[PDB]
Amino acid sequence: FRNNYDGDTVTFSPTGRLFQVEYALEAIKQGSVTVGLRSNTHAVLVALKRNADELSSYQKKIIKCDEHMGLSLAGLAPDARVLSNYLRQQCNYSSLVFNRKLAVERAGHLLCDKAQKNTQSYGGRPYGVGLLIIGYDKSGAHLLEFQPSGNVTELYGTAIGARSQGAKTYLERTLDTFIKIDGNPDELIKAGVEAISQSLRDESLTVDNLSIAIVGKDTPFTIYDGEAVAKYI
Amino acid sequence: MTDRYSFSLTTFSPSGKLGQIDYALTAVKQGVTSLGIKATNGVVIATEKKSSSPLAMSETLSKVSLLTPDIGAVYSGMGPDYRVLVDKSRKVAHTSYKRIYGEYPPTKLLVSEVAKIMQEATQSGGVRPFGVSLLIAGHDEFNGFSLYQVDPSGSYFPWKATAIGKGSVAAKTFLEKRWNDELELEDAIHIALLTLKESVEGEFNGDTIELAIIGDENPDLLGYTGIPTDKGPRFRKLTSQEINDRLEAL
Amino acid sequence: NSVFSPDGRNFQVEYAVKAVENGTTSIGIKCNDGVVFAVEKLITSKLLVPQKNVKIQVVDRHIGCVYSGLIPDGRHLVNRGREEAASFKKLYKTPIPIPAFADRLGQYVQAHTLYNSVRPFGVSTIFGGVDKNGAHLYMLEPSGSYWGYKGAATGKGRQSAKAELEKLVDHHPEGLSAREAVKQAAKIIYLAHEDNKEKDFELEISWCSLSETNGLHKFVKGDLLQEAIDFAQKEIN
Amino acid sequence: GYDRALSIFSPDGHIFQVEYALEAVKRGTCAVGVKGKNCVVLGCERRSTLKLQDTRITPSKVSKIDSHVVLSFSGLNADSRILIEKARVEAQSHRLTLEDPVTVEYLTRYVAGVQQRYTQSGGVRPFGVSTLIAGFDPRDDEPKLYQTEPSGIYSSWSAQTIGRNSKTVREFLEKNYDRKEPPATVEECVKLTVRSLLEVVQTGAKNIEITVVKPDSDIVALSSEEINQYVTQIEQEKQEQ
Amino acid sequence: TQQPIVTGTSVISMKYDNGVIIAADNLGSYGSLLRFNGVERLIPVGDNTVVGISGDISDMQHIERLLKDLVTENAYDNPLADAEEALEPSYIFEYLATVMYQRRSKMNPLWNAIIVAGVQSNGDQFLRYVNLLGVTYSSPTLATGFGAHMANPLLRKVVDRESDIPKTTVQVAEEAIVNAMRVLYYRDARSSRNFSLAIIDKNTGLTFKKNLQVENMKWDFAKDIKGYGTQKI
Amino acid sequence: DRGVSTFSPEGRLFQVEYSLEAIKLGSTAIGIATKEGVVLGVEKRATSPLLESDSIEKIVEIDRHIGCAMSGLTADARSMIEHARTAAVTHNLYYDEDINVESLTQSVCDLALRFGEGASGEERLMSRPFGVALLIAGHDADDGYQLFHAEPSGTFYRYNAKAIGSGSEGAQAELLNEWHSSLTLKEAELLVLKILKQVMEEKLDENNAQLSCITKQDGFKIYDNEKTAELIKELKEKEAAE
Amino acid sequence: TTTLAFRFQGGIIVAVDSRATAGNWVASQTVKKVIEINPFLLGTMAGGAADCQFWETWLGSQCRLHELREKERISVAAASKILSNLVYQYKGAGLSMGTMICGYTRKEGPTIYYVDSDGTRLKGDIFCVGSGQTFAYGVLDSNYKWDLSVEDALYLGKRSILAAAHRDAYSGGSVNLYHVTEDGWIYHGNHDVGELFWKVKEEEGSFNNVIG
Amino acid sequence: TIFSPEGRLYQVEYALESISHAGTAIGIMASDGIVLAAERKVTSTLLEQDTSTEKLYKLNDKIAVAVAGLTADAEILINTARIHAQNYLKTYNEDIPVEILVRRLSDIKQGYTQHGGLRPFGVSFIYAGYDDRYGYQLYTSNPSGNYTGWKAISVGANTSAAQTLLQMDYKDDMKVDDAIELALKTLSKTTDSSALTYDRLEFATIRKGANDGEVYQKIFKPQEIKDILVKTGIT
Numbered sequence A: 001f002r003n004n005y006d007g008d009t010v011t012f013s014p015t016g017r018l019f020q021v022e023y024a025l026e027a028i029k030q031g032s033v034t035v036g037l038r039s040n041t042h043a044v045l046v047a048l049k050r051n052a053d054e055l056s057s058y059q060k061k062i063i064k065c066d067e068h069m070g071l072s073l074a075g076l077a078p079d080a081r082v083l084s085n086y087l088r089q090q091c092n093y094s095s096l097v098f099n100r101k102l103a104v105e106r107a108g109h110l111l112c113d114k115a116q117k118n119t120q121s122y123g124g125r126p127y128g129v130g131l132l133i134i135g136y137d138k139s140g141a142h143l144l145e146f147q148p149s150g151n152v153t154e155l156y157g158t159a160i161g162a163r164s165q166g167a168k169t170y171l172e173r174t175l176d177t178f179i180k181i182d183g184n185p186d187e188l189i190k191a192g193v194e195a196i197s198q199s200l201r202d203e204s205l206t207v208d209n210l211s212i213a214i215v216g217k218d219t220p221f222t223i224y225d226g227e228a229v230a231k232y233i
Numbered sequence B: 001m002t003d004r005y006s007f008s009l010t011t012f013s014p015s016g017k018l019g020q021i022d023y024a025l026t027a028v029k030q031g032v033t034s035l036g037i038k039a040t041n042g043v044v045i046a047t048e049k050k051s052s053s054p055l056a057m058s059e060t061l062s063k064v065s066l067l068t069p070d071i072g073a074v075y076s077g078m079g080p081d082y083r084v085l086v087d088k089s090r091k092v093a094h095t096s097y098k099r100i101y102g103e104y105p106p107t108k109l110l111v112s113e114v115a116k117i118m119q120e121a122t123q124s125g126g127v128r129p130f131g132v133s134l135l136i137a138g139h140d141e142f143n144g145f146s147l148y149q150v151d152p153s154g155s156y157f158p159w160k161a162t163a164i165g166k167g168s169v170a171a172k173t174f175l176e177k178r179w180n181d182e183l184e185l186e187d188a189i190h191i192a193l194l195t196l197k198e199s200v201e202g203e204f205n206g207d208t209i210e211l212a213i214i215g216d217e218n219p220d221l222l223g224y225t226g227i228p229t230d231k232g233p234r235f236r237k238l239t240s241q242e243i244n245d246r247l248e249a250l
Numbered sequence C: 001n002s003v004f005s006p007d008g009r010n011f012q013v014e015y016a017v018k019a020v021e022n023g024t025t026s027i028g029i030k031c032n033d034g035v036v037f038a039v040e041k042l043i044t045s046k047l048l049v050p051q052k053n054v055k056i057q058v059v060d061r062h063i064g065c066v067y068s069g070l071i072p073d074g075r076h077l078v079n080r081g082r083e084e085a086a087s088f089k090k091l092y093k094t095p096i097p098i099p100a101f102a103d104r105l106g107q108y109v110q111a112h113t114l115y116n117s118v119r120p121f122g123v124s125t126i127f128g129g130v131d132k133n134g135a136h137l138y139m140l141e142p143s144g145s146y147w148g149y150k151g152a153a154t155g156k157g158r159q160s161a162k163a164e165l166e167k168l169v170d171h172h173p174e175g176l177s178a179r180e181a182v183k184q185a186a187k188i189i190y191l192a193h194e195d196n197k198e199k200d201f202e203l204e205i206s207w208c209s210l211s212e213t214n215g216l217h218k219f220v221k222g223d224l225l226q227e228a229i230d231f232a233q234k235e236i237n
Numbered sequence D: 001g002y003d004r005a006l007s008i009f010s011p012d013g014h015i016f017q018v019e020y021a022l023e024a025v026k027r028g029t030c031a032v033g034v035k036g037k038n039c040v041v042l043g044c045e046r047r048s049t050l051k052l053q054d055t056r057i058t059p060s061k062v063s064k065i066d067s068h069v070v071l072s073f074s075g076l077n078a079d080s081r082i083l084i085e086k087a088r089v090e091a092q093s094h095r096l097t098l099e100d101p102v103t104v105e106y107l108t109r110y111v112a113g114v115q116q117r118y119t120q121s122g123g124v125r126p127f128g129v130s131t132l133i134a135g136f137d138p139r140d141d142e143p144k145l146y147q148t149e150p151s152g153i154y155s156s157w158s159a160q161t162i163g164r165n166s167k168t169v170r171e172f173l174e175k176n177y178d179r180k181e182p183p184a185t186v187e188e189c190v191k192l193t194v195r196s197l198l199e200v201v202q203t204g205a206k207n208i209e210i211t212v213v214k215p216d217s218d219i220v221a222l223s224s225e226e227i228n229q230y231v232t233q234i235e236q237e238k239q240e241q
Numbered sequence E: 001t002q003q004p005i006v007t008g009t010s011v012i013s014m015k016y017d018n019g020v021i022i023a024a025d026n027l028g029s030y031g032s033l034l035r036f037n038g039v040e041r042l043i044p045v046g047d048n049t050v051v052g053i054s055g056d057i058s059d060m061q062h063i064e065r066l067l068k069d070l071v072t073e074n075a076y077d078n079p080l081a082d083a084e085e086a087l088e089p090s091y092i093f094e095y096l097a098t099v100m101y102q103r104r105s106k107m108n109p110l111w112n113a114i115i116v117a118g119v120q121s122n123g124d125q126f127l128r129y130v131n132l133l134g135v136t137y138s139s140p141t142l143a144t145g146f147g148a149h150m151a152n153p154l155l156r157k158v159v160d161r162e163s164d165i166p167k168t169t170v171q172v173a174e175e176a177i178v179n180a181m182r183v184l185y186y187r188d189a190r191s192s193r194n195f196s197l198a199i200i201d202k203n204t205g206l207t208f209k210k211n212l213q214v215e216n217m218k219w220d221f222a223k224d225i226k227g228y229g230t231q232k233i
Numbered sequence F: 001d002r003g004v005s006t007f008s009p010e011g012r013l014f015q016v017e018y019s020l021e022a023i024k025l026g027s028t029a030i031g032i033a034t035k036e037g038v039v040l041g042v043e044k045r046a047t048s049p050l051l052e053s054d055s056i057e058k059i060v061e062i063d064r065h066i067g068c069a070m071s072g073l074t075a076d077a078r079s080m081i082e083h084a085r086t087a088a089v090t091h092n093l094y095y096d097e098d099i100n101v102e103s104l105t106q107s108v109c110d111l112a113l114r115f116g117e118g119a120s121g122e123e124r125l126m127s128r129p130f131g132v133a134l135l136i137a138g139h140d141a142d143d144g145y146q147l148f149h150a151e152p153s154g155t156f157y158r159y160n161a162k163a164i165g166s167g168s169e170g171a172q173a174e175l176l177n178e179w180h181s182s183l184t185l186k187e188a189e190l191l192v193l194k195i196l197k198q199v200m201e202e203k204l205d206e207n208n209a210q211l212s213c214i215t216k217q218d219g220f221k222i223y224d225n226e227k228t229a230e231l232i233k234e235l236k237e238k239e240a241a242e
Numbered sequence G: 001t002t003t004l005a006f007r008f009q010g011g012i013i014v015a016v017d018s019r020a021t022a023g024n025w026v027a028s029q030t031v032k033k034v035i036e037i038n039p040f041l042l043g044t045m046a047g048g049a050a051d052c053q054f055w056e057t058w059l060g061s062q063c064r065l066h067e068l069r070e071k072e073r074i075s076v077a078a079a080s081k082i083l084s085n086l087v088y089q090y091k092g093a094g095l096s097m098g099t100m101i102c103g104y105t106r107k108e109g110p111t112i113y114y115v116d117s118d119g120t121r122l123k124g125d126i127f128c129v130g131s132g133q134t135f136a137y138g139v140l141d142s143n144y145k146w147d148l149s150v151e152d153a154l155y156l157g158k159r160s161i162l163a164a165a166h167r168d169a170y171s172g173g174s175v176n177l178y179h180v181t182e183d184g185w186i187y188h189g190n191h192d193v194g195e196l197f198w199k200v201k202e203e204e205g206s207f208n209n210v211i212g
Numbered sequence H: 001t002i003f004s005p006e007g008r009l010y011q012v013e014y015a016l017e018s019i020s021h022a023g024t025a026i027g028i029m030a031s032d033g034i035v036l037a038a039e040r041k042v043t044s045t046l047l048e049q050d051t052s053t054e055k056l057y058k059l060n061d062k063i064a065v066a067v068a069g070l071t072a073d074a075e076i077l078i079n080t081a082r083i084h085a086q087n088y089l090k091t092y093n094e095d096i097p098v099e100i101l102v103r104r105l106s107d108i109k110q111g112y113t114q115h116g117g118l119r120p121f122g123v124s125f126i127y128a129g130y131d132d133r134y135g136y137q138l139y140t141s142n143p144s145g146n147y148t149g150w151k152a153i154s155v156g157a158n159t160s161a162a163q164t165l166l167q168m169d170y171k172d173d174m175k176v177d178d179a180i181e182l183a184l185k186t187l188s189k190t191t192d193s194s195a196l197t198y199d200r201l202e203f204a205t206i207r208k209g210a211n212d213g214e215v216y217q218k219i220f221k222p223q224e225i226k227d228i229l230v231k232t233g234i235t
């Protein structure tokens, strides 16, 4: 059943499963936790950055895609670079040709379609990264979860990576409170920073640990690291 | 869309055999007997029409084919492989010869091109060798009459007389015993009929046997008159009735 | 994929069907002048935004598609249907007839069962609309097989869905209005959710009707949707 | 057409195909190079198996790449022709564009690069060849000797050897090559090179071939007679104690 | 390399207080032959935009097909296609301007002069021109062909600068357009008596008027004109 | 053997993991970033005493402000260096300025991704990952002195100090204890030389180990043998007095 | 444009004007027509400004690439040949350039190469290039000697460009002066023709065609 | 194409193994000519001896080959060799030196060894030729793409046995006629048949052109072989 069937993305198991795609999903669970959530006016990414060593830099989880859009990553980081470059181009193309800011929903569809081709081509592997995409478009704030299977879902909040199940349950409980946090960026970041804490066995999240991103009604997508996150720890 | 077998499917084994070529040669063995006999003034190629159904019209399936006005072919092995090889042989006679020198290729050179086409199915990526052996008989001004066998490996050999397919060993024996260098075409046709009766199970008549000759020029088959230097094809398929005439005094 | 078994089967396609059977249930119902499409959307978590993970897709302006199995595969197929419909419209000026469109998808799905370097699609697709000569509904399997239908169902709750569909065909042989068909689709989707009752679900309906939408594909929303839900809620108890 | 990967990583971090390419070099006839104060000598063994050869026409092991640079190898003979041809093209190209002949380092880096390329390309296998590249930079009297291997690694050597039983002759040259005192002249440099082969050849008749490279494009092969006299003197002089 | 064959003359347009007006006659000329008489050169896109096209009619028919494909394509996977994510005039314009400029850069132009008129979702008037060179400009009044020489001067007597636009009513603007169409019919040898006119108002929406005619023409003074200088009878 | 870019059941790329094993078999390379420069040091490791050690190039100049040290399958590193140099010189051509160290590193890591065939989405002109790791050191105006570790996985990390190659397990723990923000360049030099001496299998001298640094003022320099020798009397005399 | 370079006893003198023209329009009077490729290599510019600026800046990149690759400064011969071969690829496309590559290396000594967009490449001791070339030639050739002191050679360079600046409508602005040695270019200043002409007239007793 | 752990090329070795079952071909070089002789693979009474050439081929007017292996593979290579000789003649207005032609063919075989995943050609060649640089020459090439020059050589079956015999009786001062005798004796001693009759042989010479100063390739007609077989006392 798992025997001769996980050789490539081009073979179904007798159960109708694609093991290469399921194995790609396992690189996400190996990745460091990141949280995303939104209200009507803002959307926030919170990520726990991971070092290799005490002598090293913590590696970034947050990438900007346009002035109104960006994403956090969990899994194979170089795959996130490939996908965010594509997303940067799609955003760019939309501005240049149509003078139009790319809907976050269309960005979702584009990523899904790109992932899909890699779940059906021989000699190519599926992507091995999970992504949380936030944006403020012509219909407000949005959050998306992307899985390398190509499934993208729109959510009020979510978390991916190791021990992320904690943060998810928290947000599931907090729902009716944070959906309303409108016109107060600092309160929403606080609710995000608290969500990521339910996913800690590690430690206490330091100035280097912690990565926060925000976008909204009158705020371009902006990334906070180092001393600029201190006021949230 | 796109090939994943861009490598040779015929490879050498530890013992030196080319597996796929041997297996193709076994496909020839299971095939209906065909034969060729070379005379002083002609060549005869003959074979059985093993029909698949009595509801099938066996005149709609020729095993004996004109390749040029002076060259015909027959086979033993896989029919559909033969059919496509005939198309390519016809085409290559034009593209590699007639469109260059304004005349049809001599037998050996055309056989050479067919052999080449078969060789490539033995070395190229993602293909199996052709599952047939051909007998090719023809005439040309400077070489006279000739007869060639072509094998699945692309090998070809000239023959005075030979047989391929099912009972080829018994038939070659029968031919070695009967052949000589003074045979007229009618003698060769006679021997071809006798040799073929040993092979045939069922009815043995002009409707179940298929026979062609490379003989003299048939000006009545040319289709036009007025050009003296054009005399008509030497390839001639004998009719059912013409075959039955030779089976009465058999 | 290109491999025939000793008895002439294609195990890979049979395995692709198992992915479809594993999927959410979706249906189509052909009415007197159009077609209705309905699908079960599993609510994985409260965090999923209501009304915002649209499954039903439009092709051109007059065709809807719904599917079960690997959602991305279905999207891949719909992208191809859109390219295929644009190319027909480009050359022939008229929008693509539904049977013409069916074969386009058909041939494309069948191609993915010819080559060892490709896998079959892991979806079944229910689709259709209105053209020059009436309504048509089609269902398309991973093998590329497709036929016209009076009603169609695929996915996990397919068996009960088919049984409710069969009953309608029996009690309404005289051509089932567009407005009735919508109501009934809501009902049938409710009655296939019995299997997956451990998790909650959201209902999506769309329709293409001559008298109701002018032969264009529209989403059922607002009061029409609520009325169909209430009918289904009442008839389930 | 065909670009399937054949050279890939093992669980323990080796590239099997490159390692197996090294095995091919291991069975190739022995080749050695030592550098004097004002020359570089290239020595190669020829096999005993078949002694009915025509020596006039058989491809020899030492090849001119340009008029001031030579190449010898161990491993697949056929493989070596591809490297030698490409090196020669590169040499002419260099004169054409830079208006100067290649340095021995440049040429080596080029050959090594080609070798490396065949270890990371789909559809191809690595070269079953190691090379010794020897000669003099334009307008320079300082001798150069480099070695390349299937991986594409290259380095310079005072003296080096490759091929079958090279382990032995390396052991020999390690004992007998002194860096402060190199061989002072051509005559004594050849003698050391023959001595190292005589450890492995065991009659060396026309079984040893020698090539001497001097500064300013002065490259000469040695005949049997010249080699004979070296072999003769070596076993005669070294006997009594 | 190419040359217009069947052509359609001026497109004229202006801004008023609450929207835009655009008009074009119904003729397709074949050199000096007035060949076709029922030609619509105003193209509604959605219900907030009218594209007015002059120049080559075959290229005009190509641009129609593009605009319809754009509406179809925008509707795909877009639940807000008739609300917040409907096509805006500026999107439609930028798109055409991209096409036009790309085509001239490939030395294969769409032989047209185009005016995009409409109202943005924030109520703002949109009026912009693009042509076969990819030249683009905006003005309170825009006209192509003869219209640029004769319509603009009359229209500018009403809207001479930005601040004249709160001050200009629907009635005054339409009056000025209609008069300018009359002047064009007097002096343009490739113009027609029949024209279409479209009003895009932020309150009313789209009003598309077909089968309009030039009326109140002055011809009586012709009778007094004798000869070309000296002739008396 | 089935595929070249296949995931394991754990979610790891088989071939990438194995390439990391090849790096472990390499010569040791050590880099230390200070506020006065970055020191790169390598073990030369001659396979035989007849090898001319100064032909062993394991520290290379990329641009005046960027140098790098390699460990693993060092032949693989040629085209990485060629790409790096081209990126830097090209950047200067397009922009009349120096390329940022981080940007140069990212470029080298983009190149490392392109193994496989040409994956459905774009194209890959390489059959296996590189079997070599790089320490990339330099200076720029925005971030000062920097040290990066470039892996064949396409990931890269900044480090205050880093060891790669066979001695890297032992050398890293040693660097954990010894590194502090205040080190001077002279202190950094000495620490690299100390840590190499520990992990090396001969006795360390100016022929089996090599030193380099990068300062804002003088740029990237490989120290000749005389200068390193005079740092090795110095380290001996320092440890002898302790 | 007028540019020149000559070899003498004490190295190479390189001198250029600084006028940019587009038709009869004076586009600039203060333009840089020498590119400092490296501390031992200079390139001059005549013809199409963009063509020159772009390709000699590109040349510097290629020269730098050579240094990293070969661990040695590129020769004058090789640097000039890169530009020569590039320009030859583009032959007939309408590139317009007249160029001198001037430098020092141990192996070559001081060296001048003329390279143009026709593909011509010549090694020589004296070149004048540009619309003003003949004017510079007139003064340079009539006062040239191998044994000129550095001081005199710099003056002859300066004076030749002034000559061309005076007679050629398409030359002028200022003189930029360079001396290339074994050690190796040294800049010898910008000299505005507005002041230099009157200064030279007074001190030299030349320019007697000029009134006042 | 791949290497074994032993550092050998499987497919090449198996191709070589195939060749050792093909009819022996012998080449002998003398001071005034070259001999090529080859044993035809177990034939039949009905084979057309007259219009058959399975082992010996003309490459140009000065160069010929003896084949051991698959004939169809060999015709492929022979054809490109013929083209190569004509390209050289067109370029330089001189006949191609033998080594140049041999190296080219050998490079083609080598290619299949190193890239492209196609099987190697199952062919070994003996080349016999003359040119104004090296006079008479004999080379051999096999599926690996390696080539060597010889005074006398064999390929195909029983090379080991045939090589020992040639080593013994060969002498540098031979005339072609003595070389004709040597090749036939060697084939006679090493056949797996009863007798070495004419119908099982192909034979050719490259001589100094009867009487001229020019070079002539004589491909022996079956009748000629019968005579030259009596002369040498094998009948």
Ligand SMILES: Cc1ccccc1CNC(=O)[C@H](Cc1ccncc1)NC(=O)[C@H](CC(=O)NCC(C)(C)C)NC(=O)C(=O)c1c[nH]c2ccccc12
Pocket: G001, G019, G020, G021, G022, G023, G027, G028, G031, G032, G033, G045, G046, G047, G048, G049, G050, G052, G053, G096
């Ligand atoms: C070699 C050099 C290097 C640096 C500085 C100066 C020089 C001396 N050379 C010139 O002055 C040449 C003279 C020349 C003219 C026509 N042919 C061949 C040679 N001028 C140009 O190349 C000018 C330069 C220019 O105007 N630059 C603008 C700037 C930098 C001075 C502000 N461009 C132009 O005239 C120009 O671009 C054009 C003028 N009309 C055009 C229409 C279409 C496309 C381009 C042009």
Ligand SMILES: [Mg+2]
Pocket: C153, C154, C155, C158
């Ligand atoms: Mg079903």
